[PDB]
């Protein structure tokens, strides 16, 4: 009877990304996505409630979503911020949904360095590049120009569910499964 039970979980083709984005979470999601892919090519639904976290962990989840054969649909819930947005934006525009009570936030990446000028300088060049890479990724998936994203992510750019729709992040706001 745990036969018909975890079979039921796996039949939903549903992955939950709730909380801080880190390498552990990236490992769980990767496993689940790879597992679901080998079962069938049917679509996968991802519910995202994330404030963000580790950008490289976000990159992995983003790239894995595009990597697997099955079409991935995303549903934003609660909030989707920073690295969370990167993950969210991995899905094709037609497949980017949001529940009504969700807010969205994009910003430039943050970090820290201590040491010699040379060390600081090296890490500065690196975070500038990262800022550019993420901004281009956002621009591309969203329809906005690179310079628009670049200007908006200067500070914390909060968007209500409706503004996220207008901005090109969210495609369709849904309340029901359609049922």
């Amino acid at each position: 009877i745990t036969n018909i039970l975890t079979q039921k979980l796996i039949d939903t083709r549903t992955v939950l990304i709730y909380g801080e984005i880190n390498q552990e979470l990236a490992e769980d999601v990767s496993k689940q996505l790879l597992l679901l892919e080998s079962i069938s090519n049917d679509p996968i639904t991802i519910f995202i409630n994330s404030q963000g976290g580790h950008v490289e962990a976000g990159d992995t989840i983003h790239d894995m979503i595009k990597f697997i054969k099955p079409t991935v649909k995303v549903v934003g819930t609660g909030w989707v911020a920073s690295a969370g947005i990167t993950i969210y934006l991995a899905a094709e525009k037609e497949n980017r949904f949001s529940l009504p009570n969700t807010r969205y936030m994009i910003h430039q990446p943050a970090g820290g360095v201590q040491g010699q000028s040379t060390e600081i300088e090296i890490e500065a060049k690196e975070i500038i590049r990262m800022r550019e890479r993420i901004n281009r990724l956002i621009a591309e998936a969203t329809g906005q120009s690179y310079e628009q994203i670049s200007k908006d992510t200067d500070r914390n750019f909060w968007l209500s569910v409706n503004e996220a729709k207008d901005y090109g992040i969210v495609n369709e706001i849904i309340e029901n499964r359609d049922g």
Binding site: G112, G115, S117
Partner: protein
Amino acid sequence: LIPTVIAYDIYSRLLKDRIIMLGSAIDDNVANSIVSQLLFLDAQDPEKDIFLYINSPGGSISAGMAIYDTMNFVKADVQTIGMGMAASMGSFLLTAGANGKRFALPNAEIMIHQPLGGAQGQATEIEIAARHILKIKERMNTIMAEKTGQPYEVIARDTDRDNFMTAQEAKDYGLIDDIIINKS
């Protein structure tokens, strides 16, 4: 143990002979004390030399820069004597003494250095910090090139990492003018 000999404490007594002891890490507090001592000694007699003993591992660049600018500001010649260790800002201050009046005791260690710092926050903030410390590095190298007689590129090359020197090596490099061995 800070002895008081007649009413004067030992550093106060030495200050009466125009001797300033810089014997700790340089921060805003130490800087303010040294600056005040320099300002006071010059007000008392702008004609007589000041003696700045340096035994410091360095510290805040801006703090040391206050001492540096005050050294050049006062009319009196500030002689610098390196003892024990003069590293980072300590060796910078040592090299900043009046021409021909920069000395080190025979076994004093001198160490020169690229600036150290930190940067936190968003990419923009980190860039602001990086640009700032790079600017600091460049003007520090420029002042050192000038005081030593070394070309800029040589200073930049030789301060890339911790560079330890004997008093003799410091003299050969242009950092100090001579080594004192005895009083006479």
